[PDB]
Design a protein around this ligand. Structure first.
Ligand code: 2NJ
Length: 126
């Protein structure tokens, strides 16, 4: 079996910014989710080979994970906060699409998403 290449985290011809909203997304939002007891499945791309999930990347065509988001934030990959918020939402959605209601992983994603929503509710004005 084979994993796909990970999402890109570097692209020199993509225009970039470091806005106060993006700073908040790193220092408050990512940091909060990263340290959570349920973060670990989301801290790197889904390894479909070692999890024995040969259908994962058949079903999930827009992979995203917090390891990727962390790298994107640390390397100032984004132009705006909405791009990054979309990445978090892609990560959660992927989990709900692939897995079954009530599965441990879904409970984990739901706990992280609750915190995510609480933090982005107070996203600072630009
Ligand atoms: C984020 N993630 C998954 O969505 C896969 C899920 C899983 C389902 C069935 C069998 C094995 C794993 N849980 C999971 C576990 C570890 C890392 C990522 C995931």
């Amino acid at each position: 079996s084979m994993n796909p290449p990970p999402p890109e985290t570097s692209n020199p011809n993509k225009p970039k910014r470091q806005t106060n909203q993006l700073q908040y997304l790193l220092r408050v939002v990512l940091k909060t989710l990263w340290k959570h007891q349920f973060a670990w499945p989301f801290q790197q791309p889904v390894d479909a080979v070692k999890l024995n999930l040969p259908d994962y990347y058949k079903i999930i065509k827009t992979p995203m994970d917090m390891g990727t988001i962390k790298k994107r934030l640390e390397n100032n990959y984004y132009w705006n906060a909405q791009e990054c918020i979309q990445d978090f939402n892609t990560m959660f959605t992927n989990c709900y699409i692939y897995n079954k209601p009530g599965d441990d992983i879904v409970l984990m994603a739901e706990a992280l998403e609750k915190l995510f929503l609480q933090k982005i509710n107070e996203l600072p004005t630009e």
